[PDB]
Amino acid sequence: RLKEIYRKEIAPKLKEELQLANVMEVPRVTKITLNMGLGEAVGDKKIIENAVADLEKITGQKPVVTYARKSIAGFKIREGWPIGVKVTLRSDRMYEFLDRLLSISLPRVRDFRGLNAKSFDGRGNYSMGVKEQIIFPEIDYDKIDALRGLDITLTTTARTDDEGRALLRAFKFPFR
């Protein structure tokens, strides 16, 4: 899949493209975490059992559900009952998840000129959202509930975001 692809040309090219003196400090992606914070289920507690099932299909790893860390009465919740779920992807799963999201589903989202370069932190990690849960080809169109805002987060071994951006120049990232 994308394992051998990374170490055939992407890794060798980025070695001399930033003029590096050693080979490990070339940026690589370690983990991808999805997350999707369900603002609802404040009292109903009826979408956790539905958010667990759908998020399974995209990846195939059993998700873990996260709980509130505080009270914050402004949202009429408190710690103890869950508000969101998350999954962590590593090694083979996160590469094969990338290409499926890279172009099996991302081109067919709706409207997009590309992925902006302004969604970078100061260290070299990328984060971007997904406006609809049905976008992926792993689920249907009718037997799924309403809009759910799944998210993508990227984590790379980049010292600063520019070579992180440079690493993402490969992988055919739609960067404008």
């Binding site: 195939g60 059993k62 499926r100 172009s103 099996i104 081109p107 080809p137 739609p174």
Partner: protein
């Protein structure tokens, strides 16, 4: 990798209507057909 809790994972069969085929693994166990893919998108080439 924990067992009995991760549902079926396989290699499926992906085939875009433009003839594009990429053997990538997913969790459907059935062949799929794509109207559009990477080789036929306006944003990827400048349309």
């Amino acid at each position: 990798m924990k067992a009995d809790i991760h549902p079926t994972y396989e290699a499926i069969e992906a085939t875009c209507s433009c003839g594009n085929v990429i053997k990538t693994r997913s969790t459907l166990c059935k062949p799929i057909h794509l109207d559009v893919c990477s080789e036929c998108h306006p944003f990827y080439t400048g349309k």
